[PDB]
Amino acid sequence: MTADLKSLAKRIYEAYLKNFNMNKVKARVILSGSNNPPFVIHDMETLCMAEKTLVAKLVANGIQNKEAEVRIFHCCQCTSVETVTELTEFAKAIPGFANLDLNDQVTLLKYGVYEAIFAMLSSVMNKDGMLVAYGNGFITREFLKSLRKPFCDIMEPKFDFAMKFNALELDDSDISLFVAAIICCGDRPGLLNVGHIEKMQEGIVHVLRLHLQSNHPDDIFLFPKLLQKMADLRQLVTEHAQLVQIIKKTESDAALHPLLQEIYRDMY
Numbered sequence: 193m194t195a196d197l198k199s200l201a202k203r204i205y206e207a208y209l210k211n212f213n214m215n216k217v218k219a220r221v222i223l224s225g226s227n228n229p230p231f232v233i234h235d236m237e238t239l240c241m242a243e244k245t246l247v248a249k250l251v252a253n254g255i256q257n258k259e260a261e262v263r264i265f266h267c268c269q270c271t272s273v274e275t276v277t278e279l280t281e282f283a284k285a286i287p288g289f290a291n292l293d294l295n296d297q298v299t300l301l302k303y304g305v306y307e308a309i310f311a312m313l314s315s316v317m318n319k320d321g322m323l324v325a326y327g328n329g330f331i332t333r334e335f336l337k338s339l340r341k342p343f344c345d346i347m348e349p350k351f352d353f354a355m356k357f358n359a360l361e362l363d364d365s366d367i368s369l370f371v372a373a374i375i376c377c378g379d380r381p382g383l384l385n386v387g388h389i390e391k392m393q394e395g396i397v398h399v400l401r402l403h404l405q406s407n408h409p410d411d412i413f414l415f416p417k418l419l420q421k422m423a424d425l426r427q428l429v430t431e432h433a434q435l436v437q438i439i440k441k442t443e444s445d446a447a448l449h450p451l452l453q454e455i456y457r458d459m460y
């Protein structure tokens with residue numbers, strides 16, 4: 193007459209497989225090297241070729257098209273908006289989340305979504321570049337570094353995080369629980385029912401700890417390593433939000449999608 197924590201871990205994993213269009217298995221199949229192979233974006237010529245095939249509407253304007261850096265900024269936001277939708281549906285599988293007040297659900301997702309985004313982003317990155325456009329492009333790390341300031345500063349810290357995160361060799365069953373734990377942080381600003389959220393967090397972290405013990409018997413410190421990665425992600429998001437605000441204020445053509453503007457509003 194006890195919680196079945198192995199069953200819960202499997203439920204979370206199944207919800208992750210159902211709700212996220214990208215996962216580490218899918219990404220690795222593509223990155224390894226037959227249908228729909230990824231178009232490689234390594235310079236301005238190949239960026240523009242990729243846009244004409246994969247986001248035609250964005251470049252179907254005359255000399256009215258935006259600057260390449262602003263077009264990339266827009267494409268990045270589009271993926272974030274879609275991933276926020278996936279994360280919101282995923283969160284329903286977390287025991288207790290759907291029993292919280294709506295306002296607390298909103299607050300947890302508001303602070304958690306970009307931590308989860310950058311954790312899952314790691315799965316589509318290697319040291320040379322990253323998958324984009326639902327696995328149909330691969331944009332090189334060096335090309336993103338070549339963009340004009342400040343746009344060249346967006347992705348490189350995420351690559352830095354990812355290279356170390358990927359060295360932990362998590363699989364999707366681990367990542368699903370890590371993303372659930374990110375969402376269940378009881379110390380987010382503005383929460384109403386802190387006590388119930390702390391209990392929800394305790395439960396999901398217990399599931400995560402036991403799962404890592406079973407799935408990674410070789411790495412006895414993997415759980416505290418991941419606790420530290422959660423704190424690293426919070427700092428990564430804080431710095432990212434600061435850069436997004438600089439771009440919003442100084443780049444008149446770089447607009448922010450209204451759903452993301454609300455996420456960023458009063459966040460840090």
Ligand SMILES: CC[C@@H](Oc1cccc(CN(CCCOc2ccc(OC)cc2)c2nc3ccccc3o2)c1)C(=O)O
Nearest residue numbers: 214242243264265267268269271272309312313316324325
């Ligand atoms: C800039 C403001 C924006 O910052 C960022 C910063 C880093 C990452 C993102 C979201 N992201 C990159 C999409 C790039 O998308 C294209 C698409 C086409 C293209 O050219 C053809 C170029 C880039 C992403 N990928 C993922 C894959 C798996 C899981 C989660 C994922 O998250 C947004 C924000 O804050 O929303």
